Each structure stands twice: as structure tokens, then as C-alpha cells.
Amino acid sequence: TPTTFVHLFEWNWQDVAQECEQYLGPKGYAAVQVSPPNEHITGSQWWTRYQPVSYELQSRGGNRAQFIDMVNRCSAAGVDIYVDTLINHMAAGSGTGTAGNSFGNKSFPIYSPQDFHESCTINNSDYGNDRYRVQNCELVGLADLDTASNYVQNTIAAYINDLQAIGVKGFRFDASKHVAASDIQSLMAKVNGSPVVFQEVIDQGGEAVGASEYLSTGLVTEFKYSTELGNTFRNGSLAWLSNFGEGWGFMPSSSAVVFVDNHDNQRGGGAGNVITFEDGRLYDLANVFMLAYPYGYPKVMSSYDFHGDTDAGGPNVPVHNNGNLECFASNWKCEHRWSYIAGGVDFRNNTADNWAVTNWWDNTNNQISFGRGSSGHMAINKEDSTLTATVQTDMASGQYCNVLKGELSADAKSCSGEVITVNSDGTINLNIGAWDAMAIHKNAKLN
Ligand SMILES: [Ca+2]
Numbered sequence: 001t002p003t004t005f006v007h008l009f010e011w012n013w014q015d016v017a018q019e020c021e022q023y024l025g026p027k028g029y030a031a032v033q034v035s036p037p038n039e040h041i042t043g044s045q046w047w048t049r050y051q052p053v054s055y056e057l058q059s060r061g062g063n064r065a066q067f068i069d070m071v072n073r074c075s076a077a078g079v080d081i082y083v084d085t086l087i088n089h090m091a092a093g094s095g096t097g098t099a100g101n102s103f104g105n106k107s108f109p110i111y112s113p114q115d116f117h118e119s120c121t122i123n124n125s126d127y128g129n130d131r132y133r134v135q136n137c138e139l140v141g142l143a144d145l146d147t148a149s150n151y152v153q154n155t156i157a158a159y160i161n162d163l164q165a166i167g168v169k170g171f172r173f174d175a176s177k178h179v180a181a182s183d184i185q186s187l188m189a190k191v192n193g194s195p196v197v198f199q200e201v202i203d204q205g206g207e208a209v210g211a212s213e214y215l216s217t218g219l220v221t222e223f224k225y226s227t228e229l230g231n232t233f234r235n236g237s238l239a240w241l242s243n244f245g246e247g248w249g250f251m252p253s254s255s256a257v258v259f260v261d262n263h264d265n266q267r268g269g270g271a272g273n274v275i276t277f278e279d280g281r282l283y284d285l286a287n288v289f290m291l292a293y294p295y296g297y298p299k300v301m302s303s304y305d306f307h308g309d310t311d312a313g314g315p316n317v318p319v320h321n322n323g324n325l326e327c328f329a330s331n332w333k334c335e336h337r338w339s340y341i342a343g344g345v346d347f348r349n350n351t352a353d354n355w356a357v358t359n360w361w362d363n364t365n366n367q368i369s370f371g372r373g374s375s376g377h378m379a380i381n382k383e384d385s386t387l388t389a390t391v392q393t394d395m396a397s398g399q400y401c402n403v404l405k406g407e408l409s410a411d412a413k414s415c416s417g418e419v420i421t422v423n424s425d426g427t428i429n430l431n432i433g434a435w436d437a438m439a440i441h442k443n444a445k446l447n
């Protein structure tokens with residue numbers, strides 16, 4: 001059962017298309033969140049995708065024909081496409097867009113000055129006390145659309161609807177906190193059917209606009225998950241996570257989109273708790289916890305090495321560079337392909353018939369282990385000494401592949417990596433080295 005999606009950050013359409021066929025599909029990833037496909041300002045920086053010029057499908061990722069080719073190929077492979085949608089604003093200043101269109105002083109090919117809120121700057125103190133300014137003023141000089149306008153709503157709804165006709169199945173509503181939920185509610189009335197919709201609301205608490213306001217219009221991103229997972233793996237105790245979710249003050253599980261990191265917070269760096277690809281084995285573990293724990297709708301992040309430059313765009317070379325995969329090195333990192341992360345995804349897919357956390361065990365510090373009923377069990381050792389405890393599981397006796405390190409063979413007599421034994425009483429005598437882990441499930445059992 002598909003349970004996890006991935007953000008192929010700055011991946012062009014031909015690369016996403018190929019990735020769907022030879023990797024995402026076969027592996028069971030449910031969907032791919034793509035970078036904004038609409039016309040945007042020119043420049044090589046990543047953030048240019050967040051400054052729209054028009055709704056024409058001509059971007060850094062490719063043109064309309066290439067976008068449609070990608071949605072056709074991914075769908076045939078069983079993978080949905082979620083489009084990153086800009087509902088709050090258009091580009092700042094004046095310039096040229098990727099399709100040739102010029103704009104300037106709140107004048108675009110599809111909007112005129114009257115379609116925007118009157119200019120004002122959002123200052124850092126407004127987030128805390130002034131909701132009106134967080135929603136009606138300009139986020140870093142970006143022309144704030146008058147999202148209450150029937151015309152603005154029909155123009156955005158028409159873009160969303162053209163995309164669904166092409167075959168797109170979900171949408172990420174960028175910067176939702178800056179759009180009144182009532183406006184998002186009218187817009188949704190104009191959207192045909194019921195596509196997956198997740199809204200980006202950054203709410204760490206004490207904000208004048210809360211994420212709970214967006215629960216009725218779709219899924220919401222729970223940034224507290226990302227923020228708290230990092231503080232816990234970096235400075236806290238994993239034992240604390242026994243009841244991660246609602247008890248930590250997070251929104252309902254069925255309404256949340258969770259991640260260890262996203263394209264924005266992985267850039268900030270230095271003092272900040274977020275765990276990213278730069279943390280190596282720490283990143284594996286955080287991901288294994290996320291993918292094993294039954295909370296939220298998780299998205300795996302796929303980044304590129306930005307080399308300290310937080311404005312830089314992606315590598316010059318494509319991912320699939322003529323039968324030569326450009327992953328894991330100094331260009332694309334390809335985390336969705338990392339042994340522990342992919343294995344975590346395989347775990348989540350095979351334990352979807354039991355969303356409970358059973359037989360939770362910890363050492364009060366950084367060694368944990370828990371099960372998903374009789375569907376699977378896992379353990380993490382984030383300490384410098386071998387984990388040898390005996391834990392209780394609800395699993396059938398026999399030998400299983402630790403899916404974080406290998407898989408079951410065609411004949412089903414062996415695994416390509418470490419094997420874990422479940423005793424007749426249902427226990428496991430753990431033998432997990434320092435900073436390592438295991439995950440086993442019912443469909444990766446020997447002979
Ligand atoms: Ca706004």
C-alpha cells in the first residue's frame with residue numbers, strides 16, 4: 001500500500017518521468033511533489049520558482065509538452081503528481097518571465113494593479129499580533145494577490161483545473177498562512193472534484209494565524225514535527241517520542257503532512273535544529289523513525305548539494321545523464337534512494353494494516369524499539385554502545401530481513417543483508433551496533 005511521497009526539488013520533467021518508471025513506481029512511493037511548473041521570473045536561483053509571471057506551463061523544469069509527458073509516464077507507473085501552487089502572490093518589481101512575458105509595477109499578463117492588495121510590508125512583529133497584516137501585506141515585496149476577488153479566484157481555479165485535466169492529482173498551496181482561510185475556502189468551491197490538497201502553514205505557536213484554521217480546506221504541513229524531531233535527535237532523548245503527535249500539541253494525524261526537512265528549512269544552517277542530508281547517519285535515523293512511526297502523511301526530501309550557497313539553483317547536469325545516474329555525490333543527493341530511507345518506505349508500506357504503536361520500549365535515553373502490531377517491528381540505537389536488550393513483539397516466530405540493509409530474495413530463502421530472528425515467545429534479542437537500526441515486517445520473512 002502506497003504511504004509516502006517525495007519532493008524532487010528542482011528536478012526537470014524528463015528526470016522526474018524517468019525516476020517514476022525505474023524507481024518510484026517499482027518501490028511504492030505514492031507521489032512526487034514537483035517544483036512550480038508555471039512561468040516564473042528569470043534567473044538561476046531556486047527561489048525564482050516562487051515568483052510567478054503567469055500560469056503558462058513554461059518553466060525551468062521544461063515546457064507544456066514535457067510536463068504533460070511526465071504526468072502521462074508517472075501515472076502509467078502508478079505515481080501521482082502534486083503541483084506546487086502559488087495562491088498568495090506574483091513576482092516583485094519588474095522583469096521578464098521564462099515564457100517571454102514582461103511584467104512590472106503590479107501589471108501582469110493576467111492581472112492588473114486592482115487585483116492586488118494595497119502595498120504594505122509585513123514586519124517580523126506582525127506574525128505575533130497582527131493577522132490582518134500577515135494576510136494582506138507583501139511577503140518580502142511579493143505582490144500580494146487579492147484572494148477575496150472573484151476574478152483572482154477564477155483565474156487561480158482555472159489553472160488548478162487545467163492541471164487536473166492533464167492528469168495532476170494533488171496540489172501544495174504555497175504560503176497559505178498569508179491567505180485568509182475563508183478565501184482558500186471560496187477558491188476550493190471553484191475547484192472541480194476533490195484532489196489531494198496540502199497547505200503550507202508555518203505555525204510553531206504564538207502566531208496570530210494558526211494552522212488549525214486550515215484543517216477544513218485540506219491537509220496542513222505540521223512544521224512542529226520537523227522542528228521537534230530535530231531538537232530531539234540532536235539535544236534530547238528518543239525515549240520522549242513514545243507519544244509523538246497529538247500529545248506534543250500537534251494537529252490530528254489524518255490532517256498532517258510531515259517531513260524531517262523541506263527545501264526551505266534545510267537552508268536555514270549552523271545554529272538550528274533541523275536534520276538534513278549533511279548530517280549523514282543522523283539523517284537516516286530521523287527518517288527511519290518518521291517512516292516507522294504511524295503519524296501524518298510523510299514526504300521524503302530529495303536535495304542537491306548547494307555547497308554553502310543558499311541561493312544557488314540545482315546542478316547543471318541532469319539526474320539521468322545517459323545511463324549514468326548522477327546521485328549520492330556532489331550534485332543530486334537523492335535521499336529517496338538511500339538504503340535506510342527507501343527501506344523505511346518499504347516498512348511503512350507493509351505495516352499500513354495496523355496504525356498503532358505496540359510494545360514500546362526505551363532505555364529512558366537514546367535506544368528505542370516499537371512495533372506496528374503483528375505487521376512489523378523496529379529499533380533504533382542512537383548511542384555509542386551496542387543495543388542488546390530483549391524486546392517483546394507481536395510477530396510470528398521466524399527469520400526476517402532487516403529492510404534497512406537488504407531485501408528478501410526471489411526464492412525467499414535468503415536476504416541481501418542482516419537477518420533478525422524472532423523467538424517462539426515473540427521476543428527479539430537485539431544486537432544493534434552504535435548509530436544503527438533495524439526494521440522488519442511480515443512480507444520479508446524467510447522460506
Ligand atoms: Ca496575502
Ligand SMILES: [Cl-]
Pocket residue numbers: 200221262
Ligand atoms: Cl512543505
